Amino acid sequence: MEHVAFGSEDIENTLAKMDDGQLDGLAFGAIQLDGDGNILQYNAAQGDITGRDPKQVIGKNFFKDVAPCTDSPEFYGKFKEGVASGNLNTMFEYTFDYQMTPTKVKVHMKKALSGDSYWVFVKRV
């Protein structure tokens, strides 16, 4: 188990050292997106929450293909403003309900340290 707490102030520095195997040891769901919303990384805890198979969703677009319930001003709209501005750090509750039992989660979106990548972190509430 990797010990990093959800919501930690310097989480992007800590997660910069992990490969996909290490990300699978986190206590919470983690998705890495490019600035178009394509999925680059998707960990085991996220798949436990959503039912998706991690290897199968890498390369898909999160907003168009995987998670249409997030294509809303309340989720996608926040992401796209962050990508446009080059800064993003926001936490909110949301319900995931596409092809699954409706599940309430806490979401933390934060710009990654390097380049044009963005984290989505998720835990149950």
Ligand SMILES: *C(=O)/C=C/c1ccc(O)cc1
């Ligand atoms: C709504 O369509 C949410 C879907 C969803 C959220 C997060 C995931 O990792 C996968 C699907």
